[PDB]
Amino acid sequence: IIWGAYAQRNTEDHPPAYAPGYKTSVLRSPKNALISIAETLSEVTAPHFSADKFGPKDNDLILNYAKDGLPIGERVIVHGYVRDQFGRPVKNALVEVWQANASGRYRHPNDQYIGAMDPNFGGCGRMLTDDNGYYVFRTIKPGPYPWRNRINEWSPAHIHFSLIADGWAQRLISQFYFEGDTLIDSCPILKTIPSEQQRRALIALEDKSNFIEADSRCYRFDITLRGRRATYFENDLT
Amino acid sequence: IIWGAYAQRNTEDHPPAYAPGYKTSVLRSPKNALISIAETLSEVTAPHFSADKFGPKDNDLILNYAKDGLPIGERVIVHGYVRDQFGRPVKNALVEVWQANASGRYRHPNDQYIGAMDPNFGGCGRMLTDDNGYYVFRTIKPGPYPWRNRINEWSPAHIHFSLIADGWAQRLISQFYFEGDTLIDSCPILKTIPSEQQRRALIALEDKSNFIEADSRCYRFDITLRGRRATYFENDLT
Amino acid sequence: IIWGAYAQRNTEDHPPAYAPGYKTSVLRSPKNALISIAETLSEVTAPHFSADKFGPKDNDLILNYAKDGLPIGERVIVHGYVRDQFGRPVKNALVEVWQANASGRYRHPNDQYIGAMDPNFGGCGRMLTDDNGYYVFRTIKPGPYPWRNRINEWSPAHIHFSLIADGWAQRLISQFYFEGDTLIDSCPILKTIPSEQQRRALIALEDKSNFIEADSRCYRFDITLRGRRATYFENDLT
Amino acid sequence: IIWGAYAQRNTEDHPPAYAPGYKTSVLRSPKNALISIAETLSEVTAPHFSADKFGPKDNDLILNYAKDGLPIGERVIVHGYVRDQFGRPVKNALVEVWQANASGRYRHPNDQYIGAMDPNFGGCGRMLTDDNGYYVFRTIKPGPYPWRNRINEWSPAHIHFSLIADGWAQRLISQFYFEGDTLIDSCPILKTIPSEQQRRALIALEDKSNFIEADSRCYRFDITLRGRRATYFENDLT
Amino acid sequence: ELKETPSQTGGPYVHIGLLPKQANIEVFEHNLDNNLVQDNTQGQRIRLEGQVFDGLGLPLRDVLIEIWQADTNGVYPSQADTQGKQVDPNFLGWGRTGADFGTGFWSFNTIKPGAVPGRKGSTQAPHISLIIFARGINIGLHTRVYFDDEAEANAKDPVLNSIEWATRRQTLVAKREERDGEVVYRFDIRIQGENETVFFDI
Amino acid sequence: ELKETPSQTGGPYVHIGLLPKQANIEVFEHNLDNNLVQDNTQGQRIRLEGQVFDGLGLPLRDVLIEIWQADTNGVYPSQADTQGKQVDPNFLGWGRTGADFGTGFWSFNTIKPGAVPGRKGSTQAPHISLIIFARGINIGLHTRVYFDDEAEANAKDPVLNSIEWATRRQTLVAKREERDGEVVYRFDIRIQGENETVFFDI
Amino acid sequence: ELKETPSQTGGPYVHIGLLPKQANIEVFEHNLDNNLVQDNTQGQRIRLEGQVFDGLGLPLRDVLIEIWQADTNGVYPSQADTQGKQVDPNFLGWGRTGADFGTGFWSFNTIKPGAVPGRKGSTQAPHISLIIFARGINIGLHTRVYFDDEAEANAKDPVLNSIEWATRRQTLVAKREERDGEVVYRFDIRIQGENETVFFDI
Amino acid sequence: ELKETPSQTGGPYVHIGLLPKQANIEVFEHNLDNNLVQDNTQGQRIRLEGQVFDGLGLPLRDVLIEIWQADTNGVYPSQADTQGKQVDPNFLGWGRTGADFGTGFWSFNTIKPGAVPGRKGSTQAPHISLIIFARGINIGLHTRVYFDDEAEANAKDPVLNSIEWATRRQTLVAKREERDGEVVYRFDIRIQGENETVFFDI
Ligand SMILES: [Fe+3]
Ligand SMILES: [Fe+3]
Ligand SMILES: [Fe+3]
Ligand SMILES: [Fe+3]
Ligand SMILES: [O-]
Ligand SMILES: [O-]
Ligand SMILES: [O-]
Ligand SMILES: [O-]
Secondary structure, eight states, X not given: OEEEEEOOOOGGGSOOSOOTTSGGGGTSSOSXXXXXXXXXXXXXXXXXXXXXXXXXXXXXXXXXXXXXXXXXXXXXXXXXXXXETTSOBOOSOEEEEEXXXXXXXXXXXXXXXXSOOOXXXXXXXXXXXXXXXXXXXXXXXXXXXXXXXXTTEEEOSOEEEEEEOSOGGGOEEEEEEETTOGGGGTOTTGGGSOOHHHHHTTEEXXXXXXXXXXXXXXXXXXXXXXXXXXXXSOOOOO | OEEXXXXXOOGGGSOOSOOTTSGGGGTSSOSSOOEEOOOOHHHHOOOOOOGGGSOTTTTXXXXXXXXXXXXXXXXXXXXXXXXXXXXXXXXXXXXXXXOOOTTSOOSSTTOOOSSOOOTTOOOEEEEEOOTTSEEEEEEEOOXXXXXXXXXXXXXXXXXXXXXXXXXXXXXXXXXXXXXXOGGGGTOTTGGGSOOHHHHHTTEEEEOGGGOBTTTBEEEEOOEEEOOEEEESSOOOOO | OEXXXXXXXXXXXXXXXXXXXXXXGGTSSOSSOOEEOOOOXXXXXXXXXXXXXXXXXXXXXXXXXXXXXXXXXXXXXXXXEEEETTSOBOOSOEEEEEOOOTTSOOSSTTOOOSSOOOTTOOOEEEEEOOTTSEEEEEEEOOOOEEESSSTTEEEOSOEEEEEEOSOGGGOEEEEEEETTOGGGGTOTTGGGSOOHHHHHTTEEEEOGXXXXXXXXXXXXXXXXXXXXXXXSSOOOOO | OEEEEEOOOOGGGSOOSOOTTSGGGGTSSOSSOOEEOOOOHHHHOOOOOOGGGSOTTTTBTTTTTOSSSOOSSOEEEEEEEEEEXXXXXXXXXXXXXXXXXXXXXXXXXXXXOSSOOXXXXXXXXXXXXXXXXXXXXXXXXXXXXXXXXXXXXXEOSOEEEEEEOSOGGGOEEEEEEETTOGGGGTOTTGGGXXXXXXXXXXXXXXXXXXXXXXXXXXXXXXXXXXXXXXXXXXXXXO | OOOOOOOOOOOTTHHHHHOTTTTTOOOOSSOOOSBOOOTTOOSOEEEEEEOEEOTTSOBOSSOEEEEEOOOTTSOOSSTTOOSXXXXXXXXXXXXXXXXXXXXXXXXXXEEOOOOOBOSTTOBOOXXXXXXXXXXXXXXXXXXXXXXXXXXXXXXXXXXXXXOSSHHHHGGGEEEEEEETTEEEEEOOEEOSSTTOXXXXXX | OOOOOOOOOXXXXXXHHHOTTTTTOOOOSSOOOSBOOOTXXXXXXXXXXXXXXXXTSOBOSXXXXXXXXXXXXXXXXXXXXXXXXXXXXXXXXXXEEEOOTTTOOEEEEEEOOOOOBOSTTOBOOSOEEEEEEOTTOSSOEEEEEEEGGGHHHHHTOHHHHTOSSHHHHGGGEXXXXXXXXXXXXXXXXXXXXXXXXXXXXX | OOOOOOOOOOOTTHHHHXXXXXXXXXXXXXXXXXXXXXXXXXXXXXXXXXXXXXXXXXXXXXXXXXXXXXXTTSOOSSTTOOSOOOOOTTOOOXXXXXXXXXXXXXXXXXXXXXXXXXXXXXXXXXXXXXXXXXXXXXXXXXXXXXXXXXXXXXHTOHHHHTOSSHHHHGGGEEEEEXXXXXXXXXXXXXXXXXXXXXOEXX | OOOOOOOOOXXXXXXXXXXXTTTTOXXXXXXXXXXXXXXXXXXXXXXXXXXXXXXXXXXXXSOEEEEEOOOTTSOOSSTTOOSOOXXXXXXXXXXXXXXXXXXXXXXXEEEOOOOOBOSTTOBOOSOEEEEEEOXXXXXXXXXXXXXXXXHHHHHTOHXXXXXXXXXXXXXXXXXXXXXXXEEEEEOOEEOSSTTOOOOEEO
């Protein structure tokens, strides 16, 4: 198999850059249209990260910053599969996540929300997907929080994630929400996404058979990245 | 009958000038609103073209540029009627058309698409509508083609047309597509048109009873222009 | 695994031999019912073709007969999978195809249609499916054409195909059409097929993610052949 | 306007020749498919009949054979328009009609039905359509009658008609029925027609506004013949 | 667009309405018939006759036949003829007849037609267009009658040459006979079975 | 009632169909162009020229322009002109041109138009109606060209006076220059941004 | 479970794609054909030939035929043959041909096959499996060719004995002839009518 | 087929998860950063720095930047590089940094990349691929950094030449400066407004 370029990003399946309901986007969005280019080796390559550099608790947000005790909040496991748009597993991709604690408070200099800080929670983790594209991490379910867009805006609970996979073209940062959160229908950041079926692709689902008795609940969340087409005739990439 | 002005163009039945999904429109659309004016003799008059100047093959794109043989592609006849919005026939209007050949390639300096050029096809024609507003021309069905908006954009097959009729206010350039073309649902230029019923007004219909056995298929396509209102009281035009 | 016979051909999923709307069938169809037999080694065996005999351009109808330039017409890739009725891939099957050029004209002594011949197009190709049953070829999309059944009959665009696979019982010749072609609903040859879902099994689908930017469109078309049942008790084949 | 050929007869809008439910068709239908030909002057020409030869009562079946008194039965006027498939009026076409009397009995040597003969009714008439394609005749509504197909077969009431118009290709003989007749749903001759919408095209409609007080009822019945296509390019007819 | 009105059989009494004298009905002063020769009509007088047979080889005794033909110079007495030639003014070009109720024989007194232009510059051999209506026939059956003494023109005729089974072309050739000074062409029509007559969709 | 057919951009190849010689296609014997002056045409010959700029201030090198104007006495060569005056018989009043592919300059050879009646007894200042088509432009853009040496008539012009932001009226005034005996009017069009040209919905 | 893809006729040009040399197309270096005998192939060389007739008794001049057979020892050159015997290594067992466009004759140069095991311990008489494709044929028609000089084996053949109308078994027996040293088997196929060839659903 | 998961802004705290030390969180032993030069890395060391500005011309103090580049010989440290050349084994080719919360300056210590093959036999000028994430940015913005001392290679670069407004190509060229022995390339990014940086859909 000789690989060709990544399929074109479908701009209609993503938020537009300028979205006046999310106020910060007004001065941080280009006024010119993006310039589309034909891909080269620069766009279809990406770095490789070795598992040797990862610590044993890098995917355990419950324990990785715990000092005197356990963090306060709902114990949950999040797992799923990363695949490309043609259904192929994405192996050895770097998945990084970050979130607020159970109060909706981030451990960040710039976060002054009155929700309490938890001395035993950090809120960041990372993992490499396996050969089946599978990932799993454990954490405390984040609380929703207020922010200033309109003065009383509230984000639904979410976990931010980033993926660096096989091609630079696949680079993606987004966030997933939790099934049933009522704030999902009011969020101006989620409403930047044009279609209802794409808004739903960011919702992690309760996975009851995978709950661990007397211990933790579990959510299922799959991620789809752009995929490469195979070439059978001319290979113009180079 | 004393004629008054043309009815107002319904801006909601046309694409807006700024349509970010069609990238070229971003820097080529006014930021100010158009200024509407009351019509004068300048807007309700237009030039007249005499049939004497037209050659015998001006409406036969199959033969008008043929040198050594016939062009390659699907033989089709396109016909229909031009009427104003009040249903009156538009007589002696200049209809000009232009298109790509069967490969989706235009005979234009700026078109470098790999689809092959056809030495016997030119791709342009013209006709005057008759007294019933009827027009008919013969051509090779154009192939769809790729262009750079997003890198993998493809226009559905189409024939570009222009009309100069009785009033300058009626001046119109557009393009029609062919019933059934699956690319019609993905085209960002056609999606600039706000409503589904107006997108459908650009689709030429298969006219099976008018196919010519062992020779050519036929498509039916009608065009509607703005129409004048009649005056029965004050005539303020002058 | 010990293989038994092929499952019985379901005569209701195929056209009948006598179909008076396709006039040529009236004198070329048996008046007696076919005689069904129990299968023997003769029906479950078939020849093997080696890839060594195939040329590099045998599956590239765009280039395999090109002399002075490229053929005129719409560049398209057709690909898909061949499986048996139980979903197993059909490996190393001989797939042969043939079609008209962009004008709807065949390079055949008996074809006198006025649509133009293309000196750089031949219209035939062949390939062996791979181990996953996958096949891919490149060509020019054929134009529909007129023929004499009723005097003004027109076939929708199509590509004829033939398969020789693992068992003689699987031998099949048919033709596939292209999504959206309006002539599909009027063709008397396609209407010989009794059910709507089987008529749809001959339609190749637009595969937009697989289009190659500034180059070619792509259609997806899968083929299902009869499959063998496995035996766990008596093996009467021999 | 230069006329070309008649549009092809749509065989699917007509009964097939072999229809086993109408028993007489079994030995009187060709086993070979009809041979379609391209039209010549022979098929697009037809004879002309002059009105001078027509008598004053040729379209008045109530009076044209009346000797001692008026025929017994329901006084009705039948009128309508003859047009071609493109909606153009068929002018000066010869329309001939024939029917049974109010008892369902024909004045024919071969009709021995016990329904009574009417000494003042003949049952035949003729007319030329006018310049608008309009025709009108007066008659006695025929009674349904029994015939031997299955032993108890009954035809719904009907009036037989024949048209000789502008082209030999348009030659047509058929029969029309009356709105509401319950035997219409059981007739094997009407069921030879494949589609419900075509069966309905043979039903004459009650035209209440056109009833003549204290005198006659009225039915409306339009007839559509094949139409010619106009030619704008090559005229191959000759 | 409208669909053509569907055909239905003429039925067993097609004579009442189309040949009232054969049904013994006298309602019309002018009656249409099987005689196309008027006193001043030009050309060679010929008589065309035959029988129509069903699948059992039995003659139809209730069939109605009509023919349409050009004059002696191959010009049609019709406003649609575009030859620009003057047609014989004493020629209708059409006639109608029914088979005798007892024997099944039918006949027309007409004139042998001249050759008519075919498509694209071709010439058609002399022919008479014929249509058959009867109980059991759902749509009138169109055929053509060519002449055996016109072998040379028949061989080059476009319509006969468009019938790919050459063995069937002969079903369309009538046989010339010279009965007592009368030149008669015998044309039998076989609707079904062996030697089935070619029928056209025109 | 019917809705107007919707507009779509002219696209990048609008030249094939509208100025085939610029695309090097020779199919027509009579070609429409940018020269409105015939030998017997009346009036003062003027040359109208300029460039069309996009939002980055770059010239469009694929734009197609047409103008429509009255003759020297302000009568339109159109059956819809109701003035009852005889128009110059050697004047079409319309022309079409495209910008040079390299430089973006466009030009017309025409005649300075006479003043035309405005509505309700008013008089319009001399003007040329202009429309722009190009890839990126979904609907042709209508504008007008007035003349700077007609200050007095411009000040009383009904259409210019109906533009409430007076600062924008000046975008519609072309500048007169006298190049070697030729009277040239320079009219640059700015589609977007500062000094954006006024466009009309007519 | 999936339904088999439906069959459609091969159509009139089945040669372009299946016998390009007969259509005068030279695109492939290796072409498949009607010669199954290679120099080292074992067995008696025979020529198989005939014509295919339609319901009017006319030969099909656009038919495509293929045959599939075992080697001289009745072993198939196929991975599905489970006999455990070594097959002739210089034998494909398959070939394809088309009828001559003028005469309708078709032929193959092959080898007379050995007897192949039938079901449940039975032995089949020597036979060649044959399939027919052509315009007018919606699904390829399968038949078998047995040999008249194998009367004894034919009488015990399971497939021939499963045809209950014994009179039709003979349509499957080819006639041996010895033309100038060449052993030829004549097999004519009649698609419809009297002596219609038996076709199988396999 | 599946649709790509939709993008959402990185938000104001993108540092917690992507640069925990900048947020003062010590959870990882190995931390990813903005230093791509290891001791044995080959090539000329360069420092890349600048600021990112919003539409008011104010610097973003919460932006996260990443770059991806080839080694000194223009080979990518990635299994997808098909050049068949050995890459520098002490080079990750990627780094990440955030702007200083006070000043908005960001920087990377890397190596000047070698030229990489472009499509169809072409050669691309040396470049670094860069992506920007921040609150207000719904989808990471892709751009490229080319070098002003590579004028000759830049002029022939396929991607720069595919930007039709030539005036914007310059927004992608960083300026070389030689600060105390250190070769620094200054690259400022303007998201909106005048001199807005070209962004690509890759
Ligand atoms: Fe009746
Ligand atoms: Fe176009
Ligand atoms: Fe075909
Ligand atoms: Fe957040
Ligand atoms: O009847
Ligand atoms: O275009
Ligand atoms: O075909
Ligand atoms: O956030």
